[PDB]
Coordinates of C-alpha atoms in Angstrom, one line a residue:
Chain A
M1 CA 12.1 -43.7 -46.2
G2 CA 10.7 -42.5 -42.9
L3 CA 11.7 -40.6 -39.7
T4 CA 14.2 -43.2 -38.6
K5 CA 17.8 -42.0 -38.4
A6 CA 19.2 -44.4 -41.0
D7 CA 16.3 -43.6 -43.4
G8 CA 16.4 -39.9 -43.6
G9 CA 16.1 -39.0 -39.9
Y10 CA 19.4 -37.1 -40.0
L11 CA 17.9 -34.1 -41.8
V12 CA 15.5 -33.1 -39.0
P13 CA 16.6 -30.0 -37.1
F14 CA 17.2 -30.3 -33.3
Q15 CA 14.8 -28.2 -31.2
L16 CA 15.8 -27.2 -27.6
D17 CA 14.6 -24.7 -25.1
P18 CA 17.6 -23.0 -23.4
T19 CA 15.6 -21.8 -20.4
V20 CA 16.0 -23.9 -17.2
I21 CA 13.0 -25.4 -15.3
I22 CA 13.6 -25.6 -11.5
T23 CA 12.1 -28.7 -9.9
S24 CA 12.6 -27.7 -6.3
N25 CA 9.7 -27.0 -3.9
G26 CA 11.4 -24.1 -2.1
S27 CA 10.3 -22.5 1.2
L28 CA 8.3 -19.4 2.0
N29 CA 8.7 -17.7 5.4
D30 CA 7.3 -14.5 6.8
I31 CA 9.2 -14.2 10.1
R32 CA 11.6 -11.7 8.5
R33 CA 8.6 -9.3 8.2
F34 CA 7.8 -9.5 12.0
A35 CA 11.1 -10.2 13.7
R36 CA 13.6 -7.5 14.8
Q37 CA 16.6 -7.0 12.6
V38 CA 19.9 -5.5 13.7
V39 CA 23.4 -5.3 12.1
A40 CA 26.3 -7.0 13.9
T41 CA 29.7 -5.4 13.6
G42 CA 31.7 -8.2 15.2
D43 CA 31.6 -11.8 16.3
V44 CA 28.7 -11.7 18.8
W45 CA 25.8 -9.3 19.6
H46 CA 25.4 -8.5 23.3
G47 CA 22.5 -7.0 25.2
Chain B
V1 CA 16.5 -28.6 -19.6
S2 CA 15.7 -29.1 -15.9
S3 CA 17.8 -28.8 -12.8
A4 CA 17.8 -28.7 -9.0
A5 CA 18.9 -26.2 -6.4
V6 CA 22.4 -26.2 -4.9
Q7 CA 22.6 -27.5 -1.3
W8 CA 24.4 -25.4 1.3
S9 CA 25.6 -26.2 4.8
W10 CA 26.7 -24.6 8.0
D11 CA 30.5 -24.8 8.4
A12 CA 32.8 -23.9 11.3
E13 CA 36.2 -22.1 11.0
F14 CA 38.8 -23.8 8.8
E15 CA 36.3 -26.4 7.6
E16 CA 36.6 -27.9 4.1
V17 CA 33.6 -27.2 1.8
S18 CA 31.7 -30.1 0.2
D19 CA 31.0 -30.9 -3.4
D20 CA 27.7 -29.3 -4.4
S21 CA 27.5 -29.8 -8.2
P22 CA 23.9 -29.4 -9.4
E23 CA 22.1 -32.1 -11.3
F24 CA 20.5 -31.7 -14.8
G25 CA 17.8 -33.4 -16.8
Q26 CA 16.4 -33.3 -20.2
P27 CA 12.7 -33.9 -20.8
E28 CA 11.4 -35.0 -24.2
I29 CA 8.0 -34.5 -25.8
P30 CA 7.3 -36.7 -28.9
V31 CA 4.8 -35.8 -31.7
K32 CA 2.2 -38.3 -32.7
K33 CA -0.4 -38.6 -35.5
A34 CA -4.1 -39.3 -35.9
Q35 CA -6.2 -39.7 -39.0
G36 CA -9.6 -40.7 -40.3
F37 CA -11.2 -42.0 -43.5
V38 CA -14.7 -41.9 -45.0
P39 CA -15.1 -43.8 -48.2
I40 CA -18.0 -43.2 -50.5
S41 CA -19.4 -44.5 -53.8
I42 CA -19.6 -42.6 -57.1
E43 CA -23.4 -43.0 -57.4
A44 CA -23.8 -42.0 -53.7
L45 CA -21.6 -38.9 -54.4
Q46 CA -23.8 -38.0 -57.4
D47 CA -27.2 -38.6 -55.9
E48 CA -27.0 -37.4 -52.3
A49 CA -27.1 -33.6 -52.1
Chain C
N1 CA 24.9 -19.1 -19.9
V2 CA 26.5 -21.2 -17.2
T3 CA 27.5 -18.4 -14.9
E4 CA 24.1 -16.8 -14.4
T5 CA 22.4 -20.1 -14.2
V6 CA 24.7 -21.3 -11.4
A7 CA 24.3 -17.9 -9.7
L8 CA 20.5 -18.3 -9.7
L9 CA 20.9 -21.9 -8.4
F10 CA 23.0 -20.5 -5.5
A11 CA 20.2 -18.0 -4.9
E12 CA 17.4 -20.5 -4.3
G13 CA 19.8 -22.8 -2.5
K14 CA 20.6 -20.0 0.0
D15 CA 16.9 -19.2 0.3
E16 CA 16.1 -22.9 1.0
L17 CA 18.7 -23.0 3.7
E18 CA 17.9 -19.7 5.3
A19 CA 14.1 -20.1 5.4
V20 CA 14.3 -23.5 7.0
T21 CA 17.0 -22.5 9.6
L22 CA 15.0 -19.5 10.6
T23 CA 12.2 -21.8 11.8
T24 CA 13.9 -25.0 12.9
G25 CA 17.5 -24.3 13.9
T26 CA 19.0 -26.6 16.5
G27 CA 21.3 -23.9 18.0
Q28 CA 24.1 -26.4 18.5
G29 CA 27.3 -26.8 16.6
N30 CA 27.3 -24.3 13.7
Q31 CA 23.6 -23.4 13.4
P32 CA 21.8 -20.3 14.5
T33 CA 19.0 -20.9 17.0
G34 CA 15.6 -21.1 15.5
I35 CA 12.3 -19.6 16.8
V36 CA 10.7 -23.0 17.5
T37 CA 13.7 -24.5 19.2
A38 CA 14.2 -21.6 21.6
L39 CA 10.5 -21.5 22.6
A40 CA 10.3 -25.2 23.4
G41 CA 10.3 -26.5 27.0
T42 CA 9.8 -23.0 28.5
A43 CA 6.7 -21.5 29.9
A44 CA 5.7 -20.5 26.3
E45 CA 4.5 -24.0 25.5
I46 CA 0.9 -24.9 26.3
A47 CA -1.3 -27.9 25.8
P48 CA -4.7 -28.5 24.1
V49 CA -7.9 -28.6 26.2
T50 CA -8.6 -32.0 24.7
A51 CA -5.8 -34.5 24.2
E52 CA -4.8 -35.1 20.5
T53 CA -7.5 -32.6 19.4
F54 CA -7.5 -29.2 17.8
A55 CA -10.5 -26.9 18.3
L56 CA -11.5 -23.3 18.3
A57 CA -11.1 -23.3 22.1
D58 CA -7.3 -23.8 21.6
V59 CA -7.2 -21.0 19.1
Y60 CA -8.7 -18.7 21.7
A61 CA -6.5 -20.1 24.5
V62 CA -3.2 -19.4 22.7
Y63 CA -4.2 -15.8 22.3
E64 CA -5.7 -15.2 25.7
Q65 CA -2.9 -16.8 27.8
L66 CA -0.5 -13.9 27.1
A67 CA 0.3 -10.7 29.0
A68 CA -1.6 -7.6 27.8
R69 CA 1.7 -5.8 27.3
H70 CA 2.8 -8.1 24.4
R71 CA -0.7 -9.2 23.2
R72 CA -1.3 -5.8 21.6
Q73 CA 1.8 -6.3 19.5
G74 CA 1.0 -9.9 18.6
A75 CA 1.2 -11.8 15.3
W76 CA 0.1 -15.2 14.1
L77 CA 2.6 -17.5 12.3
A78 CA 1.7 -21.1 11.4
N79 CA 1.3 -23.4 8.4
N80 CA -1.4 -23.2 5.7
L81 CA -2.8 -26.5 6.9
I82 CA -3.6 -25.2 10.3
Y83 CA -5.3 -22.1 8.9
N84 CA -7.4 -24.4 6.7
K85 CA -8.4 -26.4 9.7
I86 CA -9.4 -23.2 11.5
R87 CA -11.4 -22.3 8.4
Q88 CA -13.5 -25.5 8.8
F89 CA -14.6 -24.7 12.4
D90 CA -17.8 -22.9 11.3
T91 CA -20.5 -25.2 10.0
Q92 CA -23.8 -23.3 10.8
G93 CA -22.6 -19.7 10.1
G94 CA -22.3 -18.7 13.7
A95 CA -19.7 -16.4 15.2
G96 CA -16.9 -18.4 13.7
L97 CA -17.4 -17.4 10.0
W98 CA -13.8 -16.4 9.2
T99 CA -14.6 -16.5 5.4
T100 CA -16.5 -18.5 2.9
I101 CA -15.6 -20.7 -0.1
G102 CA -14.4 -18.7 -3.1
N103 CA -12.1 -16.1 -1.3
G104 CA -8.4 -15.8 -0.7
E105 CA -6.7 -16.2 2.7
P106 CA -7.9 -13.6 5.2
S107 CA -5.3 -11.0 6.2
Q108 CA -6.4 -10.6 9.9
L109 CA -7.2 -13.1 12.6
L110 CA -8.6 -11.6 15.8
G111 CA -7.5 -8.3 14.5
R112 CA -3.8 -9.3 14.3
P113 CA -1.5 -9.7 11.3
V114 CA -1.2 -13.3 10.0
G115 CA 1.9 -15.0 8.6
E116 CA 2.6 -18.2 6.8
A117 CA 5.7 -20.4 6.9
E118 CA 5.7 -24.0 5.6
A119 CA 8.8 -25.0 7.6
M120 CA 6.6 -25.6 10.7
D121 CA 4.9 -28.9 11.4
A122 CA 1.8 -29.7 9.4
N123 CA -0.2 -32.7 10.7
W124 CA 0.1 -34.7 13.9
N125 CA -1.5 -38.1 13.1
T126 CA 0.5 -38.9 10.1
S127 CA 3.7 -37.6 11.7
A128 CA 5.9 -40.1 13.6
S129 CA 7.2 -37.3 16.0
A130 CA 5.6 -37.3 19.4
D131 CA 5.8 -33.5 19.7
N132 CA 3.9 -31.2 17.4
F133 CA 4.3 -27.4 17.4
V134 CA 1.5 -26.2 15.1
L135 CA 0.5 -22.7 16.3
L136 CA 2.6 -19.8 17.5
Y137 CA 1.6 -16.3 18.6
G138 CA 3.5 -13.5 20.3
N139 CA 5.4 -10.2 20.0
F140 CA 8.1 -10.9 17.4
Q141 CA 10.2 -8.0 18.4
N142 CA 11.8 -10.3 20.9
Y143 CA 13.3 -12.5 18.1
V144 CA 16.5 -10.7 17.0
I145 CA 18.3 -11.7 13.8
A146 CA 21.9 -10.5 13.8
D147 CA 23.2 -10.0 10.3
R148 CA 26.8 -9.5 9.4
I149 CA 27.5 -10.0 5.6
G150 CA 25.4 -10.8 2.6
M151 CA 25.9 -13.4 -0.1
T152 CA 29.2 -13.2 -2.1
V153 CA 30.1 -15.2 -5.2
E154 CA 33.8 -15.4 -5.8
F155 CA 35.6 -17.1 -8.7
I156 CA 38.5 -19.6 -8.3
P157 CA 40.9 -19.3 -11.2
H158 CA 42.6 -22.7 -10.9
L159 CA 42.2 -26.1 -9.1
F160 CA 45.1 -28.4 -8.4
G161 CA 45.3 -32.2 -8.4
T162 CA 46.9 -34.8 -6.1
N163 CA 50.4 -34.0 -7.3
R164 CA 49.8 -30.2 -6.7
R165 CA 49.6 -29.6 -10.5
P166 CA 46.7 -28.1 -12.5
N167 CA 44.1 -30.5 -13.9
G168 CA 41.9 -28.0 -15.8
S169 CA 39.0 -27.1 -13.6
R170 CA 37.8 -23.9 -12.0
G171 CA 35.6 -23.2 -9.0
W172 CA 32.8 -21.0 -7.5
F173 CA 32.8 -20.0 -3.9
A174 CA 30.0 -18.5 -1.9
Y175 CA 29.7 -17.8 1.8
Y176 CA 27.1 -16.1 4.0
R177 CA 26.9 -15.1 7.7
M178 CA 23.9 -14.7 10.0
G179 CA 22.7 -15.4 13.6
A180 CA 19.6 -15.2 15.6
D181 CA 18.1 -16.2 19.0
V182 CA 15.2 -15.2 21.3
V183 CA 16.0 -12.5 23.8
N184 CA 12.8 -13.0 25.8
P185 CA 11.2 -16.5 25.7
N186 CA 8.1 -15.3 27.6
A187 CA 6.3 -13.0 25.2
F188 CA 5.3 -16.0 22.9
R189 CA 2.7 -18.7 23.4
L190 CA 3.2 -22.0 21.5
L191 CA 0.7 -24.8 21.2
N192 CA 1.9 -28.4 21.5
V193 CA -0.3 -31.2 20.2
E194 CA 1.6 -34.1 21.8
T195 CA 0.3 -37.4 20.4
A196 CA 0.6 -40.4 22.6
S197 CA 2.9 -43.1 21.2
Chain D
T1 CA -12.6 -41.4 4.9
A2 CA -12.6 -44.2 2.3
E3 CA -15.2 -44.2 -0.4
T4 CA -16.4 -40.7 0.6
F5 CA -16.3 -37.2 -0.8
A6 CA -16.4 -34.5 1.9
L7 CA -15.6 -30.8 2.0
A8 CA -12.3 -31.4 3.8
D9 CA -11.0 -33.2 0.7
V10 CA -11.0 -29.9 -1.2
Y11 CA -8.7 -28.3 1.4
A12 CA -6.6 -31.5 1.5
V13 CA -6.0 -31.2 -2.2
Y14 CA -5.3 -27.5 -2.0
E15 CA -3.0 -27.2 0.9
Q16 CA -0.6 -30.1 0.1
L17 CA 0.9 -28.1 -2.8
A18 CA 4.1 -26.0 -2.7
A19 CA 3.6 -22.3 -2.2
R20 CA 5.5 -21.5 -5.4
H21 CA 2.9 -23.4 -7.3
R22 CA -0.2 -22.9 -5.1
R23 CA -0.2 -19.2 -5.7
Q24 CA -0.5 -19.9 -9.5
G25 CA -2.9 -22.7 -10.3
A26 CA -6.4 -23.6 -11.2
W27 CA -9.0 -26.3 -10.5
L28 CA -10.1 -28.9 -13.0
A29 CA -12.9 -31.5 -12.5
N30 CA -16.2 -32.7 -13.8
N31 CA -19.6 -31.0 -13.4
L32 CA -20.9 -33.5 -10.9
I33 CA -18.1 -32.8 -8.5
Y34 CA -18.8 -29.1 -8.6
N35 CA -22.5 -29.7 -8.0
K36 CA -21.5 -31.9 -5.1
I37 CA -19.4 -29.1 -3.7
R38 CA -22.5 -26.9 -4.1
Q39 CA -24.5 -29.4 -2.0
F40 CA -22.3 -29.0 1.1
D41 CA -24.0 -26.1 2.8
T42 CA -27.5 -26.3 4.4
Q43 CA -27.7 -23.7 7.2
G44 CA -25.4 -21.0 5.6
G45 CA -22.0 -21.8 7.1
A46 CA -18.5 -21.6 5.7
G47 CA -19.4 -24.1 2.9
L48 CA -21.7 -21.6 1.2
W49 CA -20.3 -21.2 -2.3
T50 CA -23.3 -19.8 -4.3
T51 CA -27.0 -19.8 -3.7
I52 CA -29.4 -21.6 -6.0
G53 CA -30.6 -19.5 -8.9
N54 CA -27.1 -18.5 -10.1
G55 CA -24.7 -19.9 -12.6
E56 CA -21.5 -21.9 -11.8
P57 CA -19.1 -19.7 -9.8
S58 CA -16.0 -18.3 -11.6
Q59 CA -13.5 -19.0 -8.8
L60 CA -12.8 -21.5 -6.0
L61 CA -10.8 -20.4 -3.0
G62 CA -9.7 -17.5 -5.0
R63 CA -8.4 -19.6 -7.9
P64 CA -9.7 -20.2 -11.5
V65 CA -12.1 -23.0 -12.2
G66 CA -12.2 -25.1 -15.4
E67 CA -14.3 -28.0 -16.6
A68 CA -13.7 -31.3 -18.4
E69 CA -16.3 -34.0 -18.7
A70 CA -13.8 -36.6 -19.7
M71 CA -12.8 -37.0 -16.0
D72 CA -14.3 -39.6 -13.6
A73 CA -17.1 -38.2 -11.4
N74 CA -19.3 -41.0 -10.1
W75 CA -17.5 -44.0 -8.6
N76 CA -20.1 -46.3 -7.0
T77 CA -21.8 -47.3 -10.2
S78 CA -18.5 -47.6 -12.2
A79 CA -16.7 -50.9 -12.3
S80 CA -13.3 -49.2 -12.1
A81 CA -11.4 -49.4 -8.7
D82 CA -9.7 -46.1 -9.4
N83 CA -11.4 -42.7 -9.5
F84 CA -9.6 -39.5 -10.1
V85 CA -12.2 -36.8 -9.5
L86 CA -10.5 -33.5 -8.5
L87 CA -7.2 -32.0 -9.7
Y88 CA -5.6 -28.7 -8.8
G89 CA -2.1 -27.5 -9.6
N90 CA 0.1 -25.2 -11.6
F91 CA -0.7 -25.9 -15.2
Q92 CA 2.2 -23.9 -16.6
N93 CA 4.2 -27.2 -16.5
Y94 CA 1.8 -29.0 -18.9
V95 CA 3.4 -28.6 -22.3
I96 CA 1.4 -29.2 -25.5
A97 CA 3.2 -29.5 -28.8
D98 CA 1.4 -28.3 -31.9
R99 CA 2.7 -29.2 -35.4
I100 CA -0.1 -29.2 -37.9
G101 CA -3.8 -28.5 -37.9
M102 CA -6.7 -30.5 -39.3
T103 CA -6.2 -30.9 -43.1
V104 CA -8.5 -32.8 -45.5
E105 CA -7.6 -34.4 -48.8
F106 CA -9.9 -35.9 -51.4
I107 CA -8.9 -39.1 -53.1
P108 CA -10.5 -39.2 -56.6
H109 CA -10.1 -43.0 -57.2
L110 CA -10.1 -46.0 -54.9
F111 CA -9.0 -49.5 -56.0
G112 CA -10.3 -53.0 -55.4
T113 CA -8.9 -56.4 -54.4
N114 CA -7.2 -56.8 -57.8
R115 CA -5.8 -53.3 -58.3
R116 CA -8.7 -52.3 -60.5
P117 CA -11.2 -49.4 -60.0
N118 CA -14.2 -50.2 -57.8
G119 CA -16.2 -47.0 -58.3
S120 CA -15.4 -45.5 -54.9
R121 CA -14.1 -42.2 -53.6
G122 CA -13.2 -40.9 -50.1
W123 CA -11.8 -38.2 -47.9
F124 CA -8.6 -38.3 -45.9
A125 CA -7.9 -36.1 -42.9
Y126 CA -5.1 -36.1 -40.4
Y127 CA -3.7 -34.1 -37.4
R128 CA -0.5 -34.1 -35.4
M129 CA 0.0 -33.2 -31.7
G130 CA 1.9 -34.2 -28.6
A131 CA 2.0 -33.4 -24.9
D132 CA 3.6 -34.3 -21.7
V133 CA 4.1 -33.2 -18.0
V134 CA 7.6 -31.9 -17.2
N135 CA 7.2 -31.5 -13.4
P136 CA 5.0 -34.0 -11.4
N137 CA 5.4 -32.1 -8.2
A138 CA 3.3 -29.1 -9.5
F139 CA 0.0 -31.0 -9.2
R140 CA -2.1 -32.7 -6.6
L141 CA -4.5 -35.3 -7.9
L142 CA -7.2 -36.9 -5.8
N143 CA -7.9 -40.7 -5.9
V144 CA -11.1 -42.1 -4.4
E145 CA -10.5 -45.8 -4.1
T146 CA -13.6 -48.0 -4.0
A147 CA -12.0 -51.5 -3.5
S148 CA -14.6 -54.1 -2.6
Chain E
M1 CA 30.2 -30.6 -13.7
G2 CA 31.8 -31.4 -17.0
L3 CA 31.0 -32.5 -20.6
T4 CA 29.0 -35.5 -19.5
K5 CA 25.3 -35.1 -20.2
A6 CA 23.8 -35.4 -16.7
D7 CA 26.4 -33.0 -15.3
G8 CA 25.6 -30.0 -17.5
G9 CA 26.1 -31.5 -20.9
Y10 CA 22.5 -30.7 -21.9
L11 CA 23.3 -27.1 -22.6
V12 CA 25.9 -27.5 -25.4
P13 CA 24.3 -26.5 -28.7
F14 CA 23.8 -29.2 -31.3
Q15 CA 26.0 -28.3 -34.2
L16 CA 25.2 -29.9 -37.6
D17 CA 26.1 -29.1 -41.2
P18 CA 23.0 -29.1 -43.4
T19 CA 24.8 -29.9 -46.7
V20 CA 24.8 -33.4 -48.1
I21 CA 28.1 -35.2 -48.9
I22 CA 27.7 -37.7 -51.7
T23 CA 29.6 -40.9 -51.2
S24 CA 29.2 -42.4 -54.7
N25 CA 31.9 -42.8 -57.3
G26 CA 29.6 -42.0 -60.2
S27 CA 30.9 -42.2 -63.8
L28 CA 32.6 -40.0 -66.4
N29 CA 32.1 -40.8 -70.1
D30 CA 32.4 -39.0 -73.4
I31 CA 30.2 -40.8 -76.0
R32 CA 27.5 -38.1 -75.8
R33 CA 30.0 -35.5 -76.9
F34 CA 31.3 -37.3 -80.0
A35 CA 28.2 -39.1 -81.1
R36 CA 25.2 -38.0 -83.3
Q37 CA 21.8 -37.6 -81.6
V38 CA 18.5 -37.8 -83.4
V39 CA 15.0 -37.2 -82.1
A40 CA 12.6 -40.2 -82.2
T41 CA 8.8 -40.0 -82.2
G42 CA 7.5 -43.6 -82.1
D43 CA 9.2 -46.7 -80.7
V44 CA 11.5 -47.7 -83.6
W45 CA 13.8 -45.4 -85.7
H46 CA 14.6 -46.4 -89.2
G47 CA 17.3 -45.2 -91.6
Chain F
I1 CA 11.5 -38.5 -73.3
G2 CA 13.9 -36.8 -70.9
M3 CA 14.1 -37.1 -67.1
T4 CA 10.5 -36.6 -65.8
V5 CA 9.5 -36.9 -62.1
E6 CA 5.9 -37.5 -61.2
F7 CA 4.4 -36.9 -57.8
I8 CA 1.9 -39.5 -56.5
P9 CA -0.2 -37.8 -53.8
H10 CA -1.4 -41.0 -52.1
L11 CA -0.2 -44.6 -51.7
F12 CA -2.4 -47.3 -50.3
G13 CA -2.0 -50.2 -47.9
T14 CA -2.9 -53.8 -47.4
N15 CA -6.6 -53.2 -47.1
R16 CA -6.7 -50.9 -50.2
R17 CA -6.8 -47.8 -48.0
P18 CA -4.5 -44.8 -47.5
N19 CA -1.6 -45.3 -45.1
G20 CA -0.1 -41.8 -45.0
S21 CA 2.7 -41.9 -47.6
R22 CA 3.5 -40.3 -50.9
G23 CA 5.5 -41.4 -53.9
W24 CA 8.1 -40.1 -56.3
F25 CA 8.2 -41.8 -59.7
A26 CA 10.9 -41.1 -62.4
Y27 CA 11.4 -42.7 -65.7
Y28 CA 13.6 -42.4 -68.9
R29 CA 13.2 -43.5 -72.5
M30 CA 16.1 -43.7 -75.0
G31 CA 17.9 -46.1 -77.3
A32 CA 21.1 -46.4 -79.3
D33 CA 22.8 -48.6 -81.8
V34 CA 25.4 -48.6 -84.7
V35 CA 24.6 -47.8 -88.3
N36 CA 27.9 -48.7 -90.1
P37 CA 30.1 -51.4 -88.6
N38 CA 32.9 -50.7 -91.0
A39 CA 33.6 -47.2 -89.8
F40 CA 35.4 -48.3 -86.6
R41 CA 38.4 -50.4 -85.6
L42 CA 38.5 -52.0 -82.1
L43 CA 41.4 -53.8 -80.5
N44 CA 40.9 -57.1 -78.7
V45 CA 43.6 -58.4 -76.5
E46 CA 42.6 -62.0 -76.0
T47 CA 44.2 -64.0 -73.2
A48 CA 44.3 -67.8 -73.3
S49 CA 42.6 -69.5 -70.3

């Protein structure tokens, strides 16, 4: 009688962490801090 | 539980959107055992201090 | 907790797309024009003093080949690898000691603000591309980003099958709008390390 | 450069890691490697980490520093072709499972080859533990090959 | 994204009933209710 | 003796050394028989082979 499922291994509780781990590198950019930002109220922005 | 970011794309007008279902994975970490043993004699137990 | 998990996943997906397209956007079809693409082939692109070689002379040259009107409002934007290579120029503690081992990244280069973006090119030898844009300096007020609407997440109540009947699935829609291009492709100076094929 | 350890290797390990994990990570190597890092500056250049007469520095490139002598440090004398000497990465992805501590039991009677007492006694101790890596892209390990 | 494991099936909780269900017929008998019981001390009981 | 369960803290292995197991021993003692065979009447339905 060990930890195998057929020999008493069905009485062990199931442990699980609901939190999700992201395995994506991502991307960091800083141009949004230096570039000029305006709001467009239509299809194109003219100047 | 592990996953990966959804993938977006640039679409024009009246363009059908693609299928972008995320992918999931489940890591496992098993538990192992280690042990040690030091046999001794009765006379050794009684004499050595 | 499916809904918020998928909402988060959309969040970093949008971040991945937006950060990359801000740096390398082709400008053709349905993509906003990126900073590197719009500054390539113009007078902004310069060449190293020594072919297939990066030295402190190039770091000076990119800064000094700019009009004084825009140089005073300049900023440095490149990859971490290039900054690290710059950090190796000093060997004998001369007038090239940016910083020593055991300190974080410096916040000023030649007195100007410094920025990092890993969407740019990193190394030229290992890369198979003939053109390498590794360093960029200029007045960033000439790069205008036109923004219209933010991220929206909208819920589809029902999805239909081939015979136009319900199958028992629901959907999640998200759309986002933005555009950008360079008004003046002359206030920037970009360094091109072109490796011979 | 093959079969060499130069100062550029530290930056090579450091910079090739994603910015989400680079901003939260620590170094881990053997003492000989740290001493070799110490012996990279002669005339007081950028390689100056700490002068002689002081203890081991507490941070490298603005990141925490740890020690482990179980790692491989010297490669030329060793017969192994593989040498992993320096490791930097986000260690929050290294999970250690702890179930029970060190417990010791005392057996009062041992038996012989014929299931009869042999005048022996002993102590029994065990310990349970497990660990694994859940994200291989949060680390950057250095390998110094020394083939032939 | 459905009930398959790799497509989001790793978030469904594991539901298990701790109680044990006995799958043995057993036996019912009534001698011990009608019979006479005596306490023994050694190995043989004499009358 | 009624139902008694004894706990064996350690079981050994091939080389007369602990292996990491425990034991549960239970035993029972009883006996029964008939005093007077003339106080009963049993019915035997014998079928020819």
